[PDB]
Design a protein around this ligand. Structure first.
Ligand code: PLP
Ligand code: PLP
Ligand code: CL
Ligand code: CL
Ligand code: CL
Ligand code: K
Ligand code: K
Ligand code: K
Ligand code: K
Ligand code: NA
Ligand code: NA
Lengths: 320, 319
């Protein structure tokens, strides 16, 4: 649907949420079998998710009371756990039920839902593999988080190609495993600050684009969509962009994307669960094309938000 | 001598193991309170967890003496500056608290960890001025060994990793000591899979870097070699350089090709959590004659001697 329809609905739902006297309207967490306010939630100091960031995670959205692509996200964090040699510690059916219960209890209709699986209390260094499967899980539901605020999506945002940092390469850490080892991405955020921009686009140092601080990067040139095929998370928002492109008969190329190409793009946008489809209209301080949000970006934008109401991709939470 | 130094540790350990003090198992300092490390808790929303947005350092106490504490605290300050963190206590205060914790525990041989995190406000969408309410956690445990003492007589088994390479400096500055161990942890598993213990990571560009919590040192034709870049500037490594200089042994901090590991006369690792740790098997083959070598032994001896030298150590008052 259109930006104005999507956002006006969000604003109405928010304003209602903000008037709520339910303390869980600010979020809810599940830690050691108990529901607690996120500010009160605590984890063991000795959890290896803290002591060596030895964890994977995933993030799902709820929009207008509808979970979006929950099955796809759960499959992804099962794959991440397998790649990490972590045993996912709950039945999938159990996690699905608990997450829906959390969202319902909060009353939050537009939510950010985070699932974290850590190595647990026994570190890898000095352990037998069979002693490394008592793994911990933490669940968190918050009001929907925007990597680009609604008001900013109308006009687009300001990016830089980073020059003080490059993406951690796959031979150091497999970027298809969604992880919280953000040392490169965090530095990119600071570089953007220092350079008067907001969004860092990290290279691989070998002249190609990868991803940013919590989003994939998409270029549009001569009617074709391009996005990096390696060095990045296989985003489910990106997956959804591919679906919308198919529905619209727009060619999309998953391939190596040289940095040079960003400087001649007709359109650029970022994509992620925490915000959706986020246009970029300034790059390294200069306009991207004419400086306007472009027509293919808008088609993708509208189709992406329509998927949030499509029963093939979403289901409603029962708030009771 | 591996006899004198270890035998003392074993006696001190045996005494500690019979202690009735609850803190003989360790002690932590969290939000101004002393608690057992198993009971210690951190906020879920701390960015040290939520984005591993932190630095840390580790200091030892050996035989009741802090080793090179001031060097470690200087390093932590440098790591905080590089990370844009504001170290949240006076150095005098942290020194006093750490000594108080060690004394309260009764532990004579200790692993002491200091962690500084970004705190509760994440970097994205934040003004820099709002990112300086940074958190600190302190932890004292019984001394941890990356190579157990009895194993140091024999040496350990290393591999040059082939499924992982070290995070490059352009992705994260390895001179900032950090807990983003994704490469190092995978190296530990690779070593497991290959029937070894210690992973030596490359840079992918044919040179050695460091391993999973230690620096790498080669010895060839009487000269010591260790990587200059891509690694933490270890304080154990610093101490190796001091001992080499005291013994008139040539030590070169330079790029060290992987190839050279396959021809070394001796190899050892170095770290606070274990000291000087010989490697006598590499990729399943003996290093030289498969014996702990003479230069390694001289470095080991000198390293432990420094723990009693007032220039490098001071005694904790256990009251
Ligand atoms: C990656 C790495 N290498 C080496 C070391 C050893 O440094 P130190 O001698 O200061 O314990 C540490 C700590 C570390 O994190
Ligand atoms: C989560 C994330 C993305 C986007 O993933 P989605 O599956 O679209 O939410 C992109 N890059 C990085 C580094 C991420 O952590
Ligand atoms: Cl998930
Ligand atoms: Cl620190
Ligand atoms: Cl320190
Ligand atoms: K997982
Ligand atoms: K698994
Ligand atoms: K620090
Ligand atoms: K600082
Ligand atoms: Na991520
Ligand atoms: Na480290």
């Amino acid at each position: 649907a259109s930006m104005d329809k999507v956002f006006s609905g969000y604003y109405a739902r928010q304003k209602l949420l903000e008037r709520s006297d339910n303390p869980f309207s600010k979020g809810i967490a599940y830690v050691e079998g108990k529901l607690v306010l996120p500010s009160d939630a605590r984890i063991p100091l000795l959890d290896e998710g803290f002591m060596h960031s030895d964890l994977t995670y995933d993030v799902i959205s709820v929009w207008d009371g509808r979970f979006f692509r929950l099955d796809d996200h759960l499959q992804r964090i099962l794959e991440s756990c397998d790649k990490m040699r972590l045993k996912f510690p709950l039945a999938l059916s159990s996690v699905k039920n608990i997450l829906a219960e959390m969202v319902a209890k909060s009353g939050i209709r537009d939510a950010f839902v985070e699932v974290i699986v850590t190595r647990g209390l026994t570190g890898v260094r000095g352990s037998k593999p069979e002693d490394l499967y008592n793994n911990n899980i933490y669940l968190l539901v918050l009001p929907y988080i925007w990597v680009m605020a609604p008001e900013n999506q109308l006009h687009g945002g300001e990016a830089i190609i980073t020059r003080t940092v490059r993406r951690t390469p796959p031979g150091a850490f497999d970027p298809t495993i969604k992880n919280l080892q953000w040392g490169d991405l965090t530095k990119g955020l600071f570089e953007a600050m220092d350079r008067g921009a907001t969004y860092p686009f990290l290279t691989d140092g070998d002249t190609n684009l990868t991803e940013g601080s919590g989003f994939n990067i998409v270029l549009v040139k001569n009617g074709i969509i391009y996005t990096p095929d390696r060095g990045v998370l296989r985003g489910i928002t990106r997956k959804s962009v591919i679906d919308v492109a198919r529905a619209n008969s727009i060619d999309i190329r998953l391939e190596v994307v040289p940095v040079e190409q960003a400087y001649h793009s007709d359109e650029i946008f970022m994509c992620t669960t925490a915000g959706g489809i986020m246009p970029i209209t300034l790059l390294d301080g200069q306009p991207v094309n004419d400086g306007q949000v472009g027509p293919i970006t808008k088609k993708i934008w509208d189709g992406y938000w329509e998927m949030h109401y499509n029963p093939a991709y979403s289901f409603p939470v029962d708030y009771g």
